[PDB]
């Protein structure tokens, strides 16, 4: 690992002080529980959600993007207590977020930002409620394809039943748009978790 | 790094403004040991990291860092540091023959060829500077310097490293992460299909009016060959076509410019 790279997750972990990340003594605690997805395999999908948002709200708060959350980065501290607790792990990709002779992609760029965690949030919460994945495709490059045009369904084998409010929730993450995404206090403030 | 934190003025001497710049300003200085001549640029840092003016240390390290691996014949070279209160000095290989442009201007219009010649050096440069993977990111006609005017096959510096660059799960990404295109080496044969283009006729391709016109223009590729500048070969034109592409990805790469017919 490029150090510059290895300099950044140090300095993000020496930065971050929550009971839903994990934590850094020298260069981290334990973390037992395993892939929290495992363990599993609405009302407590919404338990462990409120966890995660929790750390990401956090984590904003310092103007820190993650840019890997997916489900084998979120673990449990013990599998086996009576309110289990999750711990957002696996920084390696996180980031403080901040012409007649220019060329297009300069004039028009637009730089990534926490909005991307969001997304990931909505991801993660589709497949939360059901067992499958939204963009999920034959070939990578389908699946890529799926992620631009944001190209899913909510499925009947699985949603017939799911709530209007977590289906809003997850429409309200799953937009195109960064700037139209809810953000992580307005996540926190919907209906469906609150 | 630790630049030389001895006194400059200890070890040259300075004369002349040759260069202005937000935070910048280039002097011509003579050099005590030596008796040799340079061009020595003076820096001016941020009070605090916190602080509008002055120019950052990470940007500072980045340019001195990247000025001095490079060794070409068409690129600006560096000869030493020094360092102080309030500024970072370069020390600078002096290019005296002023802007490649205001030479041009001077004289009859050049034959396709004449151009042609000064372009080779241009690219040549960007070759050397594609295969460190840096990204110039400035290619402008007022950083393509002649390093003497007075001689019969003046040379070209490309010189300005400020904005220089080393150029360095899809389940769960956000769009604007799979659409993400990083800057890169294609951003600098952009800016070299601007220059071919000036350099040809004396117009901008993209300028219009106003700022805004400009901008417009530059992000729908909204260009011409204007018949009274450019009625120029078929090759020359397919060449600044062939750059002038918005997909980043569609544009010739510098190789493929240096292999392009109205080239080779």
Do not use: C
């Not at 390696?92 to 969001?118: Q, R, S, W």
């Not at 190209?151 to 195109?176: C, G, M, P, Q």
């Amino acid at each position: 690992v490029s150090r510059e790279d290895i300099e950044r997750e140090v300095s993000i972990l020496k930065e971050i002080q929550h009971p839903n990340v994990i934590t850094l003594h020298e260069v981290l605690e334990l973390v037992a529980g395993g892939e929290l997805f495992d363990f599993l395999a609405e009302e407590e999908a919404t338990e462990f959600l409120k966890q995660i948002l929790n750390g990401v709200y956090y984590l904003h708060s310092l103007q820190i993007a993650h840019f890997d959350l997916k489900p084998e980065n979120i673990m449990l501290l013990d599998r086996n207590v009576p309110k289990p607790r999750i711990k957002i792990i696996d920084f390696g990709l996180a980031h403080k977020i901040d012409p007649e002779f220019v060329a297009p992609e300069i004039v028009n760029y637009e730089p990534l930002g926490l909005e991307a965690d969001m997304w990931s949030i909505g991801v993660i919460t589709y497949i939360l409620l059901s067992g499958a994945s939204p963009f999920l495709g034959d070939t990578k490059q389908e699946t890529l394809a799926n992620v631009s045009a944001v190209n899913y369904e909510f499925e009947d084998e699985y949603f017939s039943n799911t709530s209007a409010l977590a289906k809003d929730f997850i429409r309200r993450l799953l937009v195109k748009d960064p700037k139209k995404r809810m953000t992580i206090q307005d996540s926190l403030q919907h209906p469906w978790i609150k």
